[PDB]
Amino acid sequence: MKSRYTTEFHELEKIGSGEFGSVFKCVKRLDGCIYAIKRSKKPLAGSVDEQNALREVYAHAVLGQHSHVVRYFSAWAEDDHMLIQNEYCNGGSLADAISENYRIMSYFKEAELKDLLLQVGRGLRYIHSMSLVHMDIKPSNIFISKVMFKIGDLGHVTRISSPQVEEGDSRFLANEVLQENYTHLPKADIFALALTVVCAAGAEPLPRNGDQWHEIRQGRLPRIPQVLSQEFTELLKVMIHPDPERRPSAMALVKHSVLLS
């Protein structure tokens, strides 16, 4: 026995539990720090599935310098497992923050939503300037650590001019991407961020398909149970515009007047 995982880390609890791969909260014995470690089944080898597993590693390994992307420390292979060791974000995911807000009827306020939008948008600005796109922006892939919001789960990351794409979650998926039209991939991360912010504003759970799904993709915001400024609401709406060329880029988003404050 005696893997690197067992020798180098103390596993504290399971925090994530999945199709491909569990995640643990662990303390590295040598440095004293807590890390989030994903232990996934090691794919067939030379396989399509292995290439997709290695893009996550390659993605994380060039996306290690940003405050709004989860930092990467190491990745390795042993047994029939692949392991990636990442920054532990101690406030958990945005999805659980939203879920708790939903039960108490107290949501993110307009100032907090602007801050979320701006932070994740700086994250995206950086990803996109590396000629990469994320492809699965959603609350369960945004982690909380001033609160700081960090983009994690780089499992769908691809290069921006990619001719093949692994489509992200349905509820956050831009229609041009469903229609296999990959001409403005970055604007699909923009579309998914707007809907991430809508969920944070206290929206009902987004639809996966059917008529409500198509109504959003026509450029119509889900109902938000709180009064937002017209300007803020306009910016969210433009972010889900049917024409992805109309959506702001991430650079135009972070320099937007609405987010100045």
| 252: contact with a second copy by CB under 8 A | no
Token readout for 209 is: 């398909």
Containing 90, the helix (H) or strand (E) segment is none
Containing 111, the helix (H) or strand (E) segment is helix 110-129
CA neighbor of 259 nearest in space, from 172, 188, 160, 193: 193
Binding partner at 138 among Cl ion, ligand 770, a second copy, none, C-beta below 5 to 8 Å by kind: Cl ion
- Scan residues 179-238 and list those touching ligand 770 (CB under 6 A): none
149-151 vs 142-144, strand pairing mode: antiparallel
174 Cβ neighbours under 8 A, 6+ residues apart: 187, 188, 191, 192, 217, 244
Binding partner at 64 among Cl ion, a second copy, ligand 770, none, C-beta below 5 to 8 Å by kind: a second copy
The one segment of 81-89, 120-128, 198-206, 247-255 that binds ligand 770 by CB under 6 A: 81-89
CA neighbor of 128 nearest in space, from 160, 103, 97, 105: 160
**Amino acid letter at 109?**
K
Token readout for 252 is: 């135009």
Beta bridge partners of 23: 16, 38
Shortest Cβ 74–a second copy spacing (Å): 5
Per-residue mark of binding to a second copy, 62-91 (x: CB under 8 A): x-xx-x---x-xxxxx-------x------
| 139: contact with Cl ion by CB under 5 A | yes
Shortest Cβ 16–Cl ion spacing (Å): 13
Containing 20, the helix (H) or strand (E) segment is none
Shortest Cβ 160–a second copy spacing (Å): 19
Binding partner at 61 among a second copy, Cl ion, ligand 770, none, C-beta below 5 to 8 Å by kind: a second copy
Instruction: Tell whether residue 142 is among the known ligand binding residues.
Output: no
| 9: contact with ligand 770 by CB under 6 A | no
- The separation between CA 204 and the C-alpha centre of its own chain, rounded to angstroms, equals 19
Token readout for 171 is: 């509820």
The one segment of 56-64, 158-166, 223-231, 240-248 that binds a second copy by CB under 8 A: 56-64
| 41: contact with a second copy by CB under 8 A | no
| 147: contact with a second copy by CB under 8 A | no
For helices 110-129 and 186-200, give the axis angle rounded to 10 degrees: 160
Binding partner at 73 among Cl ion, ligand 770, a second copy, none, C-beta below 5 to 8 Å by kind: a second copy
Binding partner at 8 among ligand 770, Cl ion, a second copy, none, C-beta below 5 to 8 Å by kind: a second copy
Beta bridge partners of 24: 14, 37
Point out which residues bind ligand 770 (CB under 6 A). 15-16, 23, 36, 38, 70, 84, 86-90, 92-93, 143, 152-153
